[PDB]
Amino acid sequence: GLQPPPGGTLEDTYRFVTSQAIACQKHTPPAPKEDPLKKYTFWEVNLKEKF
Amino acid sequence: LWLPSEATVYLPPVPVSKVVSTDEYVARTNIYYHAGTSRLLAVGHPYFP
Amino acid sequence: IKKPNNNKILVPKVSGLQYRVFRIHLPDPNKFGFPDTSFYNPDTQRLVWA
Structure with missing residues (x-):
């Protein structure tokens, strides 16, 4: 599917993430997009550049 | 019977690997590609940490 | 600056307002090798930089 009408610059990405200047950031409301099986643990094996 | 001459003259040097x-x-x-970051933000104090 | 026991200068004077007259010495081109040596006769010619 093509783009939504506001796309915007994806996430501002503040530099210094722990300070008193900025507000609370970094994935405080977690909208899915994650694995649903996150609540059930496994053994992760990372093979991103093993090939 | 053969004797040195001994003067001064500018001679070509050794070649340097250019x-x-x-x-x-x-x-x-x-093939041309594009890449651009989102935006970079920073809030701090202007005088001292 | 100098110390008052002599006339030898300790640190010298330099500021932005001085003229800067650079003297440039050059190597004498009459005394070169020039391995192809075809472009000038060494008796009726002389060489000079430009």
């Missing part, structure tokens, strides 16, 4: 431009040993292709 540096050549990159367009010689690098061939340019036809």
Whole structure:
């Protein structure tokens, strides 16, 4: 599917993430997009550049 | 009967392995890509940490 | 600056307002090798930089 009408610059990405200047950031409301099986643990094996 | 002459004269030096431009040993292709970051933000104090 | 026991300067004077007259010495081109040596006769010619 093509783009939504506001796309915007994806996430501002503040530099210094722990300070008193900025507000609370970094994935405080977690909208899915994650694995649903996150609540059930496994053994992760990372093979991103093993090939 | 043979004798030294001994004067001063400017003679060509040893050759130095020169540096050549990159367009010689690098061939340019036809594929162009784009990359751009979102935006970079920073809030702090202007005088001292 | 100098110390008052002599006249030898300790640190010298330099500021932005001085003229800067550079003298440039050159190597004498009558005394070169020039291995092809065809472009000038060494008797009826002399060489000079430009």
